[PDB]
Amino acid sequence: AGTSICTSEEWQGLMQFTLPVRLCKEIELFHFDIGPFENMWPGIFVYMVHRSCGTSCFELEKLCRFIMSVKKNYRRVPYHNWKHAVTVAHCMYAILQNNHTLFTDLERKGLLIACLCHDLDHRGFSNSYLQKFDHPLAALYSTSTMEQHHFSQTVSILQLEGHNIFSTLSSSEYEQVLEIIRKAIIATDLALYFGNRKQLEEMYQTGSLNLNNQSHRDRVIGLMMTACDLCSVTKLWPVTKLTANDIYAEFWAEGDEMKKLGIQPIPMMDRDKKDEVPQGQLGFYNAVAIPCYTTLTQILPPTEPLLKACRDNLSQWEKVIRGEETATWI
């Protein structure tokens, strides 16, 4: 019920935060894992915004309020949580640093914010679930149900007193960045990814792709959003494997709810079908992750390390299937 707001202590603490110097170098790399630095997550996001956009891009007090209120509006769910938000924003930072002048100042600030916000107030349930059981959100948002909600949550937080980091934009640029953010969040609906990637692949392969064309830019930004959202598959194997445990914790909890409503869940969401997980991961990588990073690398060549890491993880799932897995901790 309603939008949560950070405390004075929370945002003033972020304002005074300083990032250890050794991490500065590490944060630039695609494979960086925020996992071991939880106390530093909000500060890491400030650092990224300041490196990409400038220390004066946002009023610091508004930015710190905004960040700490965003954190407070992620729920304590196993996967679609604050840690996921900051991970996705970091991937976007790495993409932006490596492709910096392809994107306008307004796009960079909008996309880093969109990434931080893109799963706001997620409940640990899929679009499939909300629509199957006619949750009020599915009535309000007929397609891309949760993503429309995440964008609405974003605008609610911006509207809190002292939280509007974009107020100093011209009236025109303000409308433009909100549209950047809306499009980017909606693009995180994997339903839309399949069509988007196929279109981009064609535009790329025929040579019609043109970044001066707004609809092309929109689609490229779309694919960047998918690549950042799925970036757990681009980390080192043990990190990827641990994150998969969190994703499946959510999936199995949803499947449990469907059993109670008289419907057998898809196997992926069935905690009594964990034997099918390795094959399911293979399916996901071949159908979703590999094509995403393949097309992204064609369009943005500096992103190739995402693709190489994704391929390496695909090989690991293949090893799991062949019974070659070694010791794992969870």
Ligand X SMILES: Nc1nc(=S)[nH]c2[nH]ncc12
Interface residue list for ligand X (CB under 6 A): 230, 232-233, 247, 281, 284
Compute the least distance from the CB of residue 130 to Ni ion, in Å: 12
Task: Answer yes or no: is 229 a known binding residue.
Answer: yes
DSSP run (H or E) holding 37: none
Contact flag: residue 107 with Ni ion (CB under 5 A): no
Task: Answer yes or no: is 31 a known binding residue.
Answer: no
In the Cβ-directed half-sphere of 69, how many Cα atoms lie within 13 Å? 25
Pick 184 or 220: Cβ nearer Ni ion: 184
Say how far residue 276 (Cα) sits from the centre of its chain.
26
In this structure, are residues 30 and 306 in contact, taking their beta carbons and an 8 Å threshold? yes
Compute the least distance from the CB of residue 284 to ligand X, in Å: 4
> Which positions from 191 to 230 touch Ni ion by CB under 5 A, shown as an x/- string?
--------------------------------------x-
232 binds, among ligand X, Ni ion, none (CB under 5 to 8 A by kind): ligand X
Residue whose structure tokens are 């959003």: 225
284 binds, among Ni ion, ligand X, none (CB under 5 to 8 A by kind): ligand X
Pick 292 or 320: Cβ nearer Ni ion: 292
| Neighbour count for residue 37 (Cβ, 10 Å) | 17
Compute the least distance from the CB of residue 122 to Ni ion, in Å: 6
Contact flag: residue 121 with Ni ion (CB under 5 A): no
Beta-carbon contacts of residue 302 (< 8 Å; ≥ 6 apart): 98, 99
Residue 228 has phi, psi (to 5 degrees) of -75, -40
Pick 232 or 316: Cβ nearer ligand X: 232
Task: Answer yes or no: is 118 a known binding residue.
Answer: yes
Pick 10 or 119: Cβ nearer Ni ion: 119
Beta-carbon contacts of residue 44 (< 8 Å; ≥ 6 apart): 19, 23, 27, 34, 37, 86, 90
Pick 144 or 281: Cβ nearer ligand X: 281
In the structure encoding, which two tokens stand for residue 4, read together? 């949560």
Identify the burial level of 176 via C-beta atoms within 10 angstroms of its C-beta, where 0-12 means exposed, 13-18 middle and 19 or more buried.
middle
Task: Answer yes or no: is 256 a known binding residue.
Answer: no
> Which positions from 268 to 307 touch Ni ion by CB under 5 A, shown as an x/- string?
----------------------------------------
80 annotated active-site: yes
Q: Which of 119, 121, 246, 250 binds Ni ion (CB under 5 A)?
A: 119
Identify the burial level of 139 via C-beta atoms within 10 angstroms of its C-beta, where 0-12 means exposed, 13-18 middle and 19 or more buried.
exposed
Please give the Cα distance from 284 to 273 (Å, whole number). 17
Task: Answer yes or no: is 281 a known binding residue.
Answer: yes
Pick 164 or 226: Cβ nearer Ni ion: 226
Return the amino acid letter for 13: G
Q: Which of 31, 50, 80, 150 is catalytic?
A: 80
Look up residue 285 and give its DSSP letter.
I
Determine the size of the site formed for Ni ion (CB under 5 A). 3
Return the amino acid letter for 310: C
Please give the Cα distance from 57 to 215 (Å, whole number). 26
In the structure encoding, which two tokens stand for residue 59, read together? 């009023």
Q: Could you list the residues known to form a binding site for a divalent metal cation, using ranges.
A: 84, 118-119, 229
Active site residues: 80
Q: Which residues bind Ni ion (CB under 5 A)?
A: 119, 188, 229
Q: Could you list the residues known to form a binding site for 3',5'-cyclic AMP, using ranges.
A: 80, 281
Q: Could you list the residues known to form a binding site for 3',5'-cyclic GMP, using ranges.
A: 80, 281
